[PDB]
């Protein structure tokens, strides 16, 4: 029909569009199924420029494989939306979408209209949400439970030795920046990376690390007890907004005007020096200036002649962090400078690494902002560690924000499947078939786990389903013996919001895909 109007159009009609969608979804899941679990394999990605990236994350893998497909774009966007809110669960999403489509096709290829399976999907989704609402476990969220959750979320990205190091740092930082209300605010945890000293030296610092140092050779490199002044006022040469020029008569007038054109900044420098002399009378303490704007060599010289360490052009967000860590006030003007505005720091020092300089502020009283210092010998190592740190922080934050945590390793999926199988007799019509399909898809999570550990899918799944049928304990897979295990007792924990969001997104996207009649490319080929 559209071919008679646009001869260059491309079309895919009723029975072909469904085949295209199913084929592409299966193609995506066939690649992404090797990532699931702590036993997944690692991927290497090389771009056109020649840079190397080692990864195991689902989102990174999706966004760095060379693919041009429409429904692949849809699934990638869904995964991105899940990641940006929860930060964990971007592989199970793709796996469940693919399996749901495959199971639906199994029945559709026998002459059944997709709307029946859609209604079955909706009913099964409601029942599964009701069941998950009662499987969850509520606790106090002490340090040990958060340790377990963070470790569970971290062992799937790095090996055990590095995970045991990252868990403590992540949990300690999240607990340190927390108040008993006012939900957790990230951006108060700065991630800085240094390329040396193999990655078992990643650490947490109860202070700040700044990637720039002092620009005068005569400034002190170490300060033992310091006042911290945080400002964004400019000490650079500034000119009038309106056009202006000097008109002198001889050499002496030229000299007079030259010395006259600097008082507006000399006044600010004198204010700072007077305050420092007033507070730090004897030469025993220190004084450090952190500025968000530029500083001239003249102002640097004037400050260094007195024993002041000055840093120029700090990042904007630090304006808050220092105030929460050192405990002063960030000010825009000098017309009210007083000793209440100053913060305190117990150690300030500098470290030089090749061509770069770093400044450490440490030993604050009760810092509400901390720093995670990443270390390692390569660049892809640091990138991978950074992704793992993001995952762990999001997991701990989601655990605290909810009052509950869910057992993992696939126990909840088996429980939902068994509960859904006994619910399908109640519903009427052919929609039961759809319900069946849903149940089978929920079993894609345990199966793959077993298949990644070197066992056989069907017999291990039958063993798992043998329990939870005579003993109603929530049992999952043990990835080194293949026997069923009680997930809660061992210490495998999963987030609740992650599972709820995953169910919602998977059901919605699969339902919308199953009802597509025909694919059309009939518009302008390029926007030119």
């Amino acid at each position: 029909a559209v071919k008679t109007l646009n001869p260059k159009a491309e079309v895919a009609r009723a029975q072909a569009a469904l085949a295209v969608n199913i084929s592409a979804a299966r193609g995506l899941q066939d690649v992404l199924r090797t990532n699931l679990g702590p036993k997944g394999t690692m991927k290497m990605l090389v771009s056109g420029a020649g840079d190397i990236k080692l990864t195991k994350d689902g989102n990174v893998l999706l966004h760095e494989m060379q693919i041009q497909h429409p429904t692949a774009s849809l699934i990638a966007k869904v995964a991105t939306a899940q990641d940006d809110i929860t930060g964990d669960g971007t592989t199970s999403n793709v796996l469940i979408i693919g399996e749901l489509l495959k199971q639906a096709d199994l029945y559709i290829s026998e002459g059944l209209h997709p709307r029946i399976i859609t209604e079955g999907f909706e009913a099964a989704k409601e029942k599964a949400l009701q069941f998950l609402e009662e499987v969850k476990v509520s606790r106090e969220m002490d340090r040990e439970t958060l340790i377990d959750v963070a470790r569970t979320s971290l062992r799937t990205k790095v090996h055990a030795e590095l995970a045991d190091v990252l868990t403590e740092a992540v949990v300690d930082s999240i607990l340190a920046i927390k108040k008993q209300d006012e939900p957790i605010d990230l951006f108060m945890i700065e991630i800085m990376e240094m390329k040396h000293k193999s990655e078992t030296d990643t650490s947490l610092i109860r202070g700040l690390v700044l990637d720039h140092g002092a620009r005068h050779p005569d400034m002190k490199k170490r300060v033992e007890d310091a006042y911290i002044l945080t400002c964004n006022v400019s000490l650079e040469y500034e000119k009038t907004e309106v056009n202006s020029g000097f008109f002198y008569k001889s050499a002496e007038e030229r000299e007079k005007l030259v010395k006259a054109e600097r008082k507006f900044i000399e006044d600010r420098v004198k204010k700072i020096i007077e305050l420092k002399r007033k507070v730090c009378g004897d030469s025993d303490k220190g004084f450090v200036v952190i500025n968000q704007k530029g500083i001239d060599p003249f102002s640097l010289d004037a400050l260094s002649k007195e024993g002041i360490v000055a840093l120029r052009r700090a990042k904007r967000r630090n304006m808050e962090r220092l105030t929460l860590a050192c405990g002063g006030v960030a000010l825009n003007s000098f017309d009210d400078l007083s000793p209440d505005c100053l913060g305190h720091a117990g150690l300030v020092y500098e470290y030089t690494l090749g061509e770069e300089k770093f400044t450490f502020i440490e030993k604050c009283n009760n810092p509400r902002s901390v720093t995670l210092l990443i270390k390692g010998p390569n660049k892809h190592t640091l990138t991978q560690i950074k992704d793992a740190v993001r995952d762990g922080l999001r997991a701990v934050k989601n655990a605290i924000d909810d009052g509950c945590v869910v057992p993992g390793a696939g126990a909840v999926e088996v429980a939902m499947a068994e509960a859904l199988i006994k619910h399908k007799p109640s519903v009427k019509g052919r929609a039961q078939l759809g319900v069946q399909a849903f149940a089978d898809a929920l079993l894609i999570i345990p199966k793959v786990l077993a298949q990644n550990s070197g066992f056989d899918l069907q017999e291990t799944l039958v063993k798992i389903q043998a329990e939870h049928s005579e003993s109603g304990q929530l049992v999952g897979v043990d990835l080194n013996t293949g026997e069923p295990m009680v997930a809660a007792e061992v210490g495998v924990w999963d987030n609740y919001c992650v599972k709820k969001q995953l169910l919602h997104s998977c059901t919605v996207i699969a339902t919308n895909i199953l009802l597509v009649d025909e694919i059309m490319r009939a518009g302008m080929s390029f926007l030119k």
Binding site: D30, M42, G245, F246, S250, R254, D301, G354, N378
Partner: protein, 529 residues
């Protein structure tokens, strides 16, 4: 004929020009082959008898060198696994400064043995865990092999002997002379309670006579010329400025506006009188030489010549700071008569000529100073570049000795002992990870073998004799280079040593790189652009 169309799924959604390798046969073994080729590229330049190599880059520049890091930098590698090996070697160079070839040799040996371990039936995880266990055991064993800790690092005759081994493998046949030169230069500037900084040693290359005419100077040399007509000083008070030696003006636009004739007549005389007053005020403090980092005006130069002031200018923003450190002067951003505390002092300042090159020398009669310089003379630029690289290796060795004082025997004694003890440990491990452990120990025999292969002898006899003599209890016996028949020698008596820290970091980084390469399972590559 017919065609095999494609496989449905991922094979049909892949872009054009992209590649996808998966499995052991298409991913792991090919990576092992690439790493083996890279290791064989640089194996031949190992040891005192390793031969030089000549490389031309894409800009038609010429390198003649033995150092492995420079060779890898100048090549253009494409395979990702070799890129990981190169990055490991570069990290080792940055961290320590010597031992960038041990990394390549060890990593190649480890991957080569892992290939046959995988061929026989073992899985990658078991190979990995065996390698980690063996690495931990080796790091535990290593401190027991330490002998002859360094005693005094400000004695010239001991420092000269400690640095000889690190240069013997770069400039075989000229180790004593260069060792003594570097020892003098390093002992000059080591400060008390001092971190030794490496920047404070400068190298100047002048084309000319042979290498044996090289020297060390306590001060600075610049390849410049004097701006004024004074040429030498005998007792120099130095004033240093970062601003141009000229009348300074407003930042905002300024114009001289005159309304009568008398102002027009008087302006130039006023400027000249002001400039004369400024120069005389500067001169009255006793400064003989002025160093600036900007332009010098004609009238300022004329008045400097009038008052007998030596004027030198240099524009680097970094040479000025190093000179300020050398003479103890403080830079000034204004053109004002400086205070006594900002005076630099120098015993001699003069303009000299060495082999067609005119230089300005700031020279001290002091023995310590703040920085020192090494002046190299050669018949070819490439030779002087190689000598500079050897000097850098020696200075880094001195720095490491400052950090840690422990030495271990060299020439393959340490590797043989490590392999023997690791095999003995692995014979008592029940399980499948014993094989990997044993392979780790065998990977330590690639270091002596290479040496023998470069010396022109048979490696098997050397290794057999080393094992036989180590069975008796001689931990300090290694390969003898002078003999033309295979032989062994006591390394501790002959003074062949190497740092503990270098070996530690080399083993760590080599094992890390090998395991990281082994962990990759499938590769997705975009099309080159």
């Amino acid at each position: 004929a017919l065609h095999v169309p494609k496989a449905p799924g991922f094979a049909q959604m892949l872009k054009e020009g992209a590649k996808h390798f998966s499995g052991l046969e298409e991913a792991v073994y090919r990576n092992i082959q690439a790493c083996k080729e890279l290791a064989q590229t640089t194996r031949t330049a190992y040891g005192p008898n390793g031969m030089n190599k000549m490389v031309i880059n894409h800009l038609e520049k010429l390198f003649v060198t033995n150092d492995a890091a420079t060779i890898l930098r100048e090549l253009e590698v494409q395979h990702p696994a070799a890129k990981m090996i190169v990055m490991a070697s570069h990290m080792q160079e940055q961290e320590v400064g010597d031992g960038t070839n041990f990394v390549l040799v060890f990593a190649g040996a480890l991957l080569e043995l892992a290939e046959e371990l995988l061929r026989i039936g073992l899985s990658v995880s078991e190979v990995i865990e065996g390698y980690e266990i063996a690495c931990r055991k080796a790091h535990e064993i290593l401190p027991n092999l330490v002998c002859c800790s360094a005693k005094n690092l400000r004695d010239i005759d001991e420092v000269s002997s400690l640095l000889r081994t690190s240069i013997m493998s770069k400039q075989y046949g000229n180790e004593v002379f260069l060792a003594k030169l570097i020892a003098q230069a390093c002992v000059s500037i080591f400060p008390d309670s001092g971190h030794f900084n490496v920047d404070n040693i400068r190298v100047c290359k002048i084309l000319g006579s042979g290498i044996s005419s090289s020297s060390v100077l306590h001060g600075m040399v610049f390849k410049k010329e004097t701006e004024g007509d004074v040429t030498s000083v005998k007792d120099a008070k130095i004033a240093v400025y970062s601003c141009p030696f000229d009348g300074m003006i407003t930042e905002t636009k300024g114009t001289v506006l005159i309304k009568t004739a008398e102002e027009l007549m008087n302006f130039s005389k006023g400027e000249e009188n002001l400039m004369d007053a400024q120069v005389k005020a500067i001169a009255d403090t006793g400064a003989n030489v002025v160093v600036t980092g900007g332009k010098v005006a004609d009238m300022a130069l004329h008045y400097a010549n009038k008052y007998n002031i030596m004027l030198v200018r240099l524009n680097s923003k970094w040479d000025l700071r190093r000179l300020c450190k050398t003479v103890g002067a403080t830079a000034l951003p204004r053109l004002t008569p400086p205070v006594l505390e900002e005076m630099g002092h120098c015993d001699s300042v003069y303009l000299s000529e060495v082999g067609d090159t005119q230089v300005v020398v700031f020279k001290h009669e002091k023995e310590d100073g703040a920085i020192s310089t090494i002046v190299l003379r050669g018949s070819t630029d490439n030779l002087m570049d190689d000598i500079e690289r050897a000097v850098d290796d020696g200075v880094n060795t001195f720095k490491v000795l400052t950090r840690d004082k422990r030495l271990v025997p060299g020439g393959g004694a340490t590797e043989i002992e490590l392999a023997k003890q690791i095999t003995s440990y692995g014979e008592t491990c029940p399980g499948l990870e014993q094989y990997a452990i044993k392979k780790f120990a065998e990977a330590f025999e690639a270091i002596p073998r290479a040496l023998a292969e470069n010396s022109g002898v048979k490696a098997n006899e050397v290794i057999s004799k080393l094992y036989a003599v180590h069975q008796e209890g001689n931990k300090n016996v290694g390969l003898d280079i002078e003999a033309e028949v295979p032989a062994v020698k006591d390394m501790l008596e002959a003074g062949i040593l190497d740092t503990y820290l270098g070996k530690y970091w080399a083993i760590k980084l080599a094992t890390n790189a090998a395991v990281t390469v082994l962990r990759v399972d499938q590769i997705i590559m975009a099309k080159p652009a």
